[PDB]
Design a protein around this ligand. Structure first.
Ligand SMILES: [Zn+2]
Lengths: 210, 173, 172
């Protein structure tokens, strides 16, 4: 999960208002050119590469009438309805996910409630307690980020294929200077922006801003 | 829905089967569990030996191992509306045709000794990065249960250095 | 040993367990090829369900599957009879395959397997630069495996570590 930034809203979601209208009658081709600008070409919840894409409502469309044509509630998930990860699993799968106890990528930095170890596991952050710990333990459970073998297996490979690359940059740290090494680290953190699991790598590179 | 040459649906016995097939032909072949009583270094050279002897005979082999899959192309796999996978199995490692085509983790999930390494990082990210007593008693148990040569110790000693330098730069700030 | 001895050279498990339990209640087990007809997912939890449902009984099994060896200690592995030099309890099924069974991770016969390693060799044969021949092989890695596979996410991490190595050397 990254910290998506919702800037503007598609114009198409203004001639449609909840109630009389239905989500089906919306031309989703006019929404994607805006979602792709916000979250890039990656899933909002797991940061995989969107190849089988669909539009998900953070709060479902059945338990929350209204908010169905509201821009704030629309994200892009990685499973089309022709799956066992975020999106499809958030509805078919997990059976109780009261929406308050979930991380909204575009309103809550999903780095205070998530830690991506170099083994590809998403464990709650360090030291969280109370309600802040339930948010992490629920977003890791309703958006499967530790219980899907095809995702946990695809993030171990992506986070460990660069582990030898990380160990060298930090190895050549006490020999180099602060400015040059920081520039090299930036260049290494400016290339994961266009790579899968942009945040799993960033946590293996510097930290979850701790 | 089948292919033309291979359709994989996910030594004495194999030789007897080959001899029987050759005798029948000289006078389609749907093998079941091609990897039956075959050491791993006879599974990655079985599909390539079943075509060399028989050039043109459609095969409907069914398998359970991730090794005979690494000698087959993606288009030939048929999971169970059967649907082909989303990775190229031909040439792929026999630890990702298992994870991403058969849903089986590399390390056992039920063995408490496999989690150790992935748990040892947590005891290092909690203490700001440096080692402590509760973490050093899990590093030793990794250096006494996996021997001092193995990848498990080579990854635990890579976490130690990376997180000791990741806390060094953080400290300078 | 005393509990388990694997000598390396769920429905199916049902009848076996049922017969063993019936014989035990009515009153050493030679369990050959405990990986027979078992999906690689049930092979990871076969010896843990036999040391739990049958706590006090000596088991001698015959095995040529890396997964079921990953759930056994090295003290119980008697390969054709000295035990291996690596601990096979919690190790990756790809390192129990290379070091205990002498089977390379990728097939030797498939010429598409010697592409990542050949890529490393070519890239280190030019001092870390993608000149003209390693670039062609890298293009063939992407076109065959995928835009993001294990064989290309590893190839792209070599082109970067080598670039950094060259940059640092040019400064030193
Ligand atoms: Zn996703």
């Amino acid at each position: 999960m990254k910290e998506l930034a919702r800037l503007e809203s598609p114009e198409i979601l203004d001639q449609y208002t909840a109630g009389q209208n239905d989500w089906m009658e919306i031309d989703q081709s006019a929404v994607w050119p805006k979602l792709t600008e916000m979250q890039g070409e990656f899933c909002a919840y797991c940061e995989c590469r969107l190849n089988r894409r669909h539009i998900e409502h953070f709060r479902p469309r059945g338990k929350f009438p209204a908010l169905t044509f509201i821009w704030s509630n629309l994200f892009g998930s990685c499973g089309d309805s022709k799956w066992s990860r975020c999106g499809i699993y958030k509805d078919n799968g997990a059976g109780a996910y009261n929406a308050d106890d979930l991380i909204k990528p575009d309103e809550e930095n999903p780095d205070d409630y998530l830690l991506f170890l170099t083994t590809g596991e998403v464990v709650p952050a360090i030291g969280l307690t109370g309600r802040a710990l339930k948010k992490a333990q629920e977003t890791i459970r309703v958006f499967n980020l530790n219980g899907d073998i095809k995702l946990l297996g695809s993030r171990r490979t992506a986070v460990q294929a660069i582990m030898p690359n990380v160990e060298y940059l930090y190895s050549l740290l006490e020999e180099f200077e602060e400015d040059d090494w920081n520039e090299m680290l930036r260049d290494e953190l400016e290339k994961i922006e266009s790579d899968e699991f942009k945040t799993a790598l960033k946590h293996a590179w510097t930290s979850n801003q701790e | 829905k089948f292919e033309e040459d291979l359709t994989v649906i996910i030594q004495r016995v194999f030789l007897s089967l080959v001899a029987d097939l050759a005798r029948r032909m000289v006078m389609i072949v749907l093998i079941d569990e091609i990897e039956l009583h075959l050491h791993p270094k006879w599974q990655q050279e079985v599909i390539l030996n079943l075509r060399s002897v028989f050039p043109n005979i459609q095969f409907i082999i069914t398998t359970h191992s991730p090794i005979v899959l690494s000698t087959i192309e993606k288009r030939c796999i048929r999971e169970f509306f059967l649907d082909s996978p989303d990775m190229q199995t031909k040439g792929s490692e026999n630890a990702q045709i298992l994870e991403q085509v058969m849903n089986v983790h590399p390390t056992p999930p039920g063995i408490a000794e496999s989690h150790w390494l992935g748990d040892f990082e947590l005891l290092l990210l909690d203490n700001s990065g440096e080692l402590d007593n509760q973490s050093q008693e899990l590093y030793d148990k990794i250096k006494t249960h996996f021997g001092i040569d193995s990848a498990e110790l080579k990854k635990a000693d890579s976490l130690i250095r990376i997180n000791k330098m990741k806390n060094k730069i953080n400290k300078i700030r």
